[PDB]
Amino acid sequence: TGTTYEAETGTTLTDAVVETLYPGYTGSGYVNFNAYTNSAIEWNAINNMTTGTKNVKFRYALESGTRNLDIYVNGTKVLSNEPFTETGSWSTWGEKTIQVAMNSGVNTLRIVTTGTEGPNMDNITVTAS
């Protein structure tokens, strides 16, 4: 089974802030990206048992539209403009899972806005595929 990492703690934020306005988040809050481009959340301590493909499941809210994020693993961009589709409400928390390669031990994962801003981000769950 997996490990959940909160977006709001254990992370470095760039042009993004922790908030609690919309209910239903896990932990102490969620992250609101503020800039249409170059806002970011970086997890610096994702800790895996093995090297291989991981399921990374984002819990997020997005009232309308699709917003795209670049995704970096260990400093290298591995997904470009990955879509996050609407959930319908800022208090509807949906899920999106990507499959990405990661290493055993401690890894970093960063998600970055690229022109469409971002979903409000609650947490990620990482599971070996």
CB 30 within 8 A of CB 94: no
CB 7 within 8 A of CB 16: no
Q: How far is the CB of 104 from Ca ion (least distance, A)?
A: 26
Q: Which of residues 3-32 bind Ca ion (CB under 5 A)?
A: 6, 25-27, 30, 32
Q: How far is the CB of 17 from Ca ion (least distance, A)?
A: 9
Among 122, 124, 125, 126, which residue sits at the site for Ca ion (rule: CB under 5 A)? 122
What share of residues in the chain are helix, strand, coil (percent, to 5)? 0, 65, 35
d(Cα 79, Cα 69) in Å, to the nearest integer?
8
Annotated binding site for alpha-D-glucuronate: 19, 22, 67, 120
Residue numbers at the binding site for Ca ion (CB under 5 A): 6, 25-27, 30, 32-33, 122-123
